[PDB]
Amino acid sequence: QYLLPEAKAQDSDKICVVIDLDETLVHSSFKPVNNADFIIPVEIDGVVHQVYVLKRPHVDEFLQRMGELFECVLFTASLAKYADPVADLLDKWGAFRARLFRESCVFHRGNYVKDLSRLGRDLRRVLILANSPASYVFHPDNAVPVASWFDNMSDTELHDLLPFFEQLSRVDDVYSVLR
Ligand SMILES: [Mg+2]
C-alpha cells in the first residue's frame, strides 16, 4: 500500500508538493534561543528537553499560498513527536493535507531519502521542496532546491520561490519545466 490515501476531491486535480521541514521551513535546536517562534517539549529517553524553533522568514505567506496552489504534504526525516507539534503550530491554514515522518523515509547510504514513488501520485504531478539533494537522490528531476536555513533573518528564499510555484501549479507535467 502507498504512502498517501487517495486525494480528496478538492485536491486530486492539483500537483502534489512534498515539503521538507528542517532547514527548509524552520530551524530547530536543543541549544537555547532567546526570541524563539515556538518551543516544543520533546522526550528523549524519559527526559523532556526543550526544542527551540525558529520560523524561516515569509513562511506564513508561503504556506498559505502553497496550500491553495497544491496538494501539500509534509515529508520530514525527523520524528512525529517533534514534527507534529511543529506542524500544528506552523500550519494555520490546513495547508498540509498529510504528514509523513522518519518511518516513511528510506535510509539509503547514510541518508534519509524521501522516496516519491511510494506516494501514490503520478510523478508528472509531484514536486519536492528540500534543502539537501540527498533527500531526493531518487527524484532529482522532481526537485525544487532551497538553501538550508538556520537563522538568517533577511533570507527571502521562500517569498522569491512563489512566482515559480505559481507557474508550476498550472503545468500538466512538471518534467516539462524541470526538464
Ligand atoms: Mg531538511
Integer Cα distance of 94 and 14 in angstroms: 16
Instruction: Output the domain CATH number for residue 4.
Output: 3.40.50.1000
Question: Is there a catalytic annotation at residue 22?
Answer: yes
Cell numbers placing 79: 520524528
Q: How far is the CA of 131 from the centre of ligand 1 (A)?
A: 5
Ligand 1 mean position, distance from CA 133 (Å): 10
Annotated binding site for Mg(2+): 20, 22, 131
One-letter amino acid of 172: D
Helices and strands (H and E) in the chain: how many? 4, 10
Number of structural domains in the chain = 1
Extended strands (E) in the chain: 16-19, 26-29, 38-44, 47-55, 71-75, 96-100, 106-108, 111-113, 126-130, 143-145
- 20 tagged catalytic: yes
Tell me which residue range forms the domain holding 20.
1-179
Method: X-ray
- State the binding site: 20, 22, 131
Cα–Cα distance, 135 to 129 (Å, whole number): 10
Query: Which residues touch 172 (CB under 8 Å, ≥6 apart)?
Result: 124, 125
Cell of 65: 499560498
What is the whole-number distance in angstroms between the Cα of residue 22 and the centre of ligand 1? 4
Strand 143-145 to 126-130 pairing? parallel
Selected catalytic residue, list 22, 88, 122, 173 = 22
Note whether 83 and 21 are within 8 A (CB).
yes
CA distances to 61, 68, 86, 108, 110 from 91, in Å: 11, 13, 8, 29, 30
